[PDB]
Amino acid sequence: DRLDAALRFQQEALNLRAQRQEILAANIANADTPGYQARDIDFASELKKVMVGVALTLTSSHHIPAQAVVDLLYRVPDQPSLDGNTVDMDRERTQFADNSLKYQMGLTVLGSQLKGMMNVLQG
Amino acid sequence: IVGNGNVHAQVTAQLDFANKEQTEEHYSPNGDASKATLRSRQLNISEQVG
Numbered sequence: 408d409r410l411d412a413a414l415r416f417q418q419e420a421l422n423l424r425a426q427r428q429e430i431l432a433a434n435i436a437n438a439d440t441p442g443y444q445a446r447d448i449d450f451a452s453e454l455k456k457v458m459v460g461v462a463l464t465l466t467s468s469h470h471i472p473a474q475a476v477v478d479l480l481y482r483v484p485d486q487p488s489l490d491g492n493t494v495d496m497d498r499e500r501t502q503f504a505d506n507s508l509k510y511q512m513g514l515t516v517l518g519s520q521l522k523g524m525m526n527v528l529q530g
Numbered sequence: 531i532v533g534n535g536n537v538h539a540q541v542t543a544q545l546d547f548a549n550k551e552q553t554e555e556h557y558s559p560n561g562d563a564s565k566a567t568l569r570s571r572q573l574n575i576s577e578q579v580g
Contacts, residue, residue: 471570 441490445482
């Protein structure tokens with residue numbers, strides 16, 4: 408559908424921001440686990456990958472339709488801890504706040520596009 | 531064999547003058563996997579051994 412193509416980029420950006428938000432909050436929650444590595448995703452490359460499948464064929468009514476079913480990069484440690492935990496509070500707190508801001512911005516842009524498509528139709 | 535007149539027989543008949551109509555439906559059993567005919571089959575299998 409053409410409607411999907413217009414809203415594909417913002418939807419994928421919003422979903423990627425939510426996933427990275429979950430990853431950052433997991434990094435915050437597991438700050439005290441000894442031996443836990445701080446993981447993160449490269450937002451731009453994954454957004455390229457998602458932006459850049461074959462529903463199985465249903466011959467009749469009984470035939471069952473096809474059933475549907477990111478890469479994590481390690482953060483470079485800054486300070487060496489003794490328990491092997493590489494999670495840094497300041498870095499991930501700033502990243503968490505930034506991801507929240509960008510999620511809000513994506514919501515704003517997507518809502519503006521939908522509202523414009525709506526006022527085009529209203530009449 | 532017995533001869534003309536050396537035999538007499540009489541017959542009575544209970545007849546059927548009742549109009550009956552019947553429709554029969556039969557389904558072949560398919561409980562055995564060998565004779566079971568299938569159109570679509572979804573088999574989700576999961577084994578999380580710890």
